[PDB]
Amino acid sequence: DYAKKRGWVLGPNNYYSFASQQQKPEDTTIPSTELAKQVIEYARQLEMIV
Amino acid sequence: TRPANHRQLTFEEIAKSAKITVNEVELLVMKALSVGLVKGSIDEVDKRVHMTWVQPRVLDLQQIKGMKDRLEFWCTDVKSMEMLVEHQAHDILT
Amino acid sequence: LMPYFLLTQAVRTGNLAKFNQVLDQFGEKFQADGTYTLIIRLRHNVIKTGVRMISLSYSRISLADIAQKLQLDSPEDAEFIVAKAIRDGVIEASINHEKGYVQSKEMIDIYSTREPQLAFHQRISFCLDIHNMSVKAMRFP
């Protein structure tokens, strides 16, 4: 029953199936589109008060 | 041939393609560097050559049609950024 | 001091009998305060603190040892309780389900990659908000 949907093998003693390993994959160095937003916003509230 | 991302050549591919024994590949590469055809640098202990380059080669019309699209992406990208900044900050720059 | 100090003192130590003694003594006061959750859960969640201490000190330990360190008398239920603790998020360790091996997470990677500036953004929001609030309500007449 578990074998039909869950991973591993049904009593094998050497389970083979899909893995539940998780990797962050945060290599990307480009939050540039939003971080630029933030900076422009700071410039926005340094001005427009008169 | 290789797509810039993988510009590191293992010794074994060189030896296989030039039909020479492994112990000699170093000297081959060194000769090239000294004449000035290519200008990478080598690490013998991982046994990889890391190549950056300066020499062009002759190119036919099919490659030209090809690289036109690679160039074409760049202009859409630039225009997207200038539009983002104009909209986000017309308040200040006016 | 009279009830709560005797409690936390019993809790850090492993004396269950003294815990029962204090409970018997001051249950009336505890119910009078309307905070009688302690017997409900505190009595049966003591082992969490022991697991936390183990997390803070050691970094690679054989689970066959925690049993003698936390008087569980068996390794398997120790595996169960540690697994439950990690799922609950009290500790982020990992287990080698092969040879009684419990290992801590990776070392703290670095304290200056994208986690810092996330805080300075909040502090700017605060500071600029305060300055605007201050300047607005100045000199009504």
Add this chain to the structure above:
Amino acid sequence: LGLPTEAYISVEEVHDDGTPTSKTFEHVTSEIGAEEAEEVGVEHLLRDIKDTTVGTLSQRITNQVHGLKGLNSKLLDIRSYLEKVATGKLPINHQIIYQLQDVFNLLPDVSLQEFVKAFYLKTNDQMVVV
């Protein structure tokens, strides 16, 4: 987009491995100058319309936009040549152009896990600003 003037000088060339030598121009870099008692008249004429000498985020920010305009202009102008040569409307200037545009596509950079470790500079700007 930019400057009003161009300057050119005439020189012959080796031209190739072997095709006839000829005479054509080459570009030389150009700049606009000033001198005492010519700038004073200019500054007087331009008094009505003026801009901030340095600017405080109202002049630096505009500059970046202007720069992006210019860059995109050049990149679009490359098409009008390279596309029509791909149509075969005009002959290939194999000798020069393609070698330079191989160099170009070689020279960009990449975000390669080592460069992003120079993340540790953004945060040190912020803990002096914010």
